[model samples]
Target: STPIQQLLEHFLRQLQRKDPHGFFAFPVTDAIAPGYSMIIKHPMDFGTMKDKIVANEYKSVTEFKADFKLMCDNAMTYNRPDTVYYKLAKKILHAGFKMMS
Candidate 1:
C-alpha cells in the first residue's frame, strides 16, 4: 500500500478508537461523503487531489489530514449551519483532535 492508503487507514483507526459508538453510527463512507462531495464539486480549489487520495499518493499522514481539513472547511462553508451532513463533518473533524493530543 502507498503512503496515503496507510495514512487513511491510520486516520480511520484513530477515528474509531476515539469514538467507537459514534464511528459505528456513521459509517466511513457516510462520514466522509459531505467533505468528499464538496471536493468533487470544487476541483479547482481542492485540485485533483481527490484522485490522489483514492490512489494513495500522499507523502504522509499529515498531508492527508491537511487535505481532510480543507475538505471539512469547504463543507462547512457551503452546508447549512444546522444540516446533518455539516454536523457529521464537524463530528469527524473534532474526533481527530483526540489523536493530536
Candidate 2:
C-alpha cells in the first residue's frame, strides 16, 4: 500500500526539482474500473461517470484526476482486447506536451 506521507514527500521533492515526470501512475481504465466493474459486476448500480465528465456536468476532485481520466477514457476508444491499454495510454500522455505551448 502507498503511504500518504511518503507520497506527499515524494511529490514535494519532485516539485522542488521541477521534475518532468510526475503523477505518472494514474490511468483512464482506473477511472472506468469502478464504474465498469459496477456495471459488469453489478449492472443495477451503474453510473455514467465518463459521460457526465464529457458533458461538462461532473465536477472533478482535482485537475490531475480529470486530465488523467480523460486521457485514459480517450485511449479506451481504440484499445481492443488484443491491444494492451498502456500503448494507448502512452499516446494520451503525449497530448500533455502539446499543451505546453
Candidate 3:
C-alpha cells in the first residue's frame, strides 16, 4: 500500500481500538470544542482533503505529511500548548518512532 494509505489505515486501526479515544477524542468541555466537532465530522469540514484521502489520491509521503501538517496547524491554532489537540498535533507530526518504522 502507499504511504498515505498506510498512514490512514494505521489511524483507522487506532480508532478501532478501545483505548484509542484517549488521544483522538474531543470532549464537549474542551477549549476548542467547536473546532474538534468540525474535525470529527469529516468530508464536510475537511472537503477535498478527506475525499482524496479516502480515494488514496496522495502522491507521496511528503504530500501526505504536508497535508497532515495543515490539519495539525488548524488544530494548533485554537488549542493551548497544554490542551489535548495540541498534544495530538505533536504526536501525529512525530509519529515515526523506530519501533513503528
Evaluated with lDDT, which candidate comes out highest? 1
Query: For every model in order, what is the number of clashing pairs?
Result: 0, 1, 0
Of 1 and 3, the candidate ahead on TM-score is 1
- Per-residue error for 100 in candidate 1, Å, reads 5.6
In angstroms, the error of model 2 at 81 is 2.5
- Candidate 1 lDDT, tens digit per residue, 1-101? 77557666666556545444452333234365556454445321223344565666777767766765655565576667798656766876776655643
TM-score of each: 0.52, 0.26, 0.49
- Model 2: what TM-score? 0.26
Q: Give the residue spans of candidate 2 off by over 4 A.
A: 1-61, 86-101
lDDT of 3 by residue, 22-74 (tens): 43332333373545655543311233444566788777656644655565565
Distance from true position, residue 15, model 1, in Å?
Answer: 4.3
Model 2, residue pairs in steric clash: 28-72
Q: Which lDDT values do the candidates have, in the order given?
A: 0.56, 0.38, 0.52
Per-residue lDDT for 11 in model 2? 32
lDDT of 3: 0.52
Candidates sorted on lDDT, descending = 1, 3, 2
